[PDB]
């Protein structure tokens, strides 16, 4: 026995949510809380001091933004409860919580303590009847409806590649990199001070993030493309100010393939990705050549998959046809896939009742992990 569950597609930057069997996440709001810088002695103005969404984005000025979650590992768990309480807002739910099944998201390569504390929240502070969350890549595959695939997510500062054969991942061939657009914008901030500009405020930095997402693409041959002169079509701020560009429009996003240039013993998404592919079956790579699942919204770049095709030619196999799946609802793919799963009578076997948590809890977490 249950109610209609809700799929909460936790984007590393923007969390999303929405009831079962639907097509579009009901809510789409980010992951940070602002608190006012200035206080007042005046009587009659606003209250709250904790805002997320249009309230925060509305009056960004005093609300000092702080991202509580880092690579899934959140440190403001209490504030996450407040965030989920905000998910239970009047404008948000007006529903109950201890009487409905739900669905959140889970990326791999994580400490169990996160799931442990999560169960503590939803089953100590809440009394959720049944709830089970699994690997996000399968949800993307649900959106595809394709047995095998190479899913690559793209969070704000989180990325990971997973190959799955008919609903079976490869634990010995799954990789992850701790970065996405987060340090890309931070690196753009670096470029800003490289040519003398600081955008040290939190909101200011998110504005920089929006600028990045607004004007950035991929180049063909980076060192050869460096030989030209960027004309820097200046954009003009909401404040009304000159915005130069530099190589940032193409150089800054390729930091992903130059972690040594940023200071990290890593190689590249496609590099370690194809390495894990090499660790897979001699035969399944053939399937994965056409089964290339693109996911995550950080992927929005001109010639993104095209430069990725160039990367494929860099890591060329022994002449075998390859194909990439590049949909348009890559962020929504996981939410919709969960909605598909949430629209299944198979969750009876795929769930864990709260009574099970009452009986064991931690042991149910360890044993009934997946």
């Amino acid at each position: 026995i249950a109610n209609q569950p809700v799929v909460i597609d936790n984007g590393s930057g923007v969390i999303k949510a929405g009831f079962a069997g639907d097509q579009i996440p009901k809510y789409c709001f980010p992951n940070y809380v602002g608190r006012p810088k200035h206080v007042r002695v005046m009587a009659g103005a606003l209250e709250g001091d904790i805002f997320i969404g249009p309230k925060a984005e509305e009056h960004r000025g005093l609300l000092s933004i702080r991202y509580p979650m880092e690579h899934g590992i959140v440190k403001d768990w209490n504030d996450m409860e407040r965030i989920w309480q905000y998910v239970y807002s009047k404008d948000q739910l007006q529903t109950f919580s201890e009487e409905h099944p739900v669905l959140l998201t889970e990326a791999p390569l994580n400490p169990r303590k996160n799931r442990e504390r999560a169960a503590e929240v939803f089953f100590e502070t809440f009394n959720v009847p049944a709830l089970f969350i699994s690997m996000q890549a399968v949800l993307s595959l649900y959106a595809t409806g394709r047995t095998t695939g190479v899913v690559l997510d793209s969070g704000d500062g989180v990325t990971h590649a997973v190959p799955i054969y008919e609903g079976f991942a490869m634990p010995h061939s799954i990789m992850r990199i701790d970065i996405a657009g987060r340090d890309v914008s931070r690196f753009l901030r670096l470029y800003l001070r490289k040519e003398g500009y600081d955008f040290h405020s939190s909101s200011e930095f998110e504005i920089v993030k929006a600028i990045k997402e607004r004007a950035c693409y991929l180049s063909i041959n980076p060192q050869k493309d460096e030989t030209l002169e960027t004309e820097k079509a200046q954009y003009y701020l909401p404040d009304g100010s000159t915005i130069e560009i530099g190589p940032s429009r193409f150089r800054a996003p390729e930091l992903l393939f130059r972690p040594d240039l940023i200071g990290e013993e890593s190689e590249g998404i496609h590099e370690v990705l194809v390495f894990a592919i090499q660790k897979s079956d001699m035969d399944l790579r053939r399937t994965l050549f056409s089964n290339i699942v693109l996911s995550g919204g950080s992927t929005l770049f001109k010639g993104f998959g095209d430069r990725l095709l160039s990367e494929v030619k860099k890591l060329a196999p022994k002449d075998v046809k390859i194909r990439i799946s590049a949909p348009q609802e890559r962020l929504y793919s996981t939410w919709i896939g969960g909605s598909i799963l949430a629209s299944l009578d198979t969750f009876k076997k795929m769930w864990v009742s709260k009574k099970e948590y009452e009986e064991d809890g931690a042991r149910s977490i360890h044993r009934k992990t997946f």
Binding site: Q4, D22, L344, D345
Partner: protein, 49 residues
């Protein structure tokens, strides 16, 4: 169960994307095996000398 207004609401609830809940509601009904038992032992129930 044969009341048309409740069945009407059931059809609209199905239409409201909650097909699983509505189907599960009627699968909860063991009226099928109940009535087959009714008529199974009914000649042993009724007309008993």
């Amino acid at each position: 169960r044969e009341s048309p207004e409740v069945l009407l609401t059931l059809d609209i609830l199905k239409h409201g994307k909650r097909f699983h809940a509505t189907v599960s509601f009627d699968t909860d009904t063991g009226l099928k095996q109940a009535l087959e038992t009714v008529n199974d032992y009914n000649p042993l129930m009724k007309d008993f000398p």
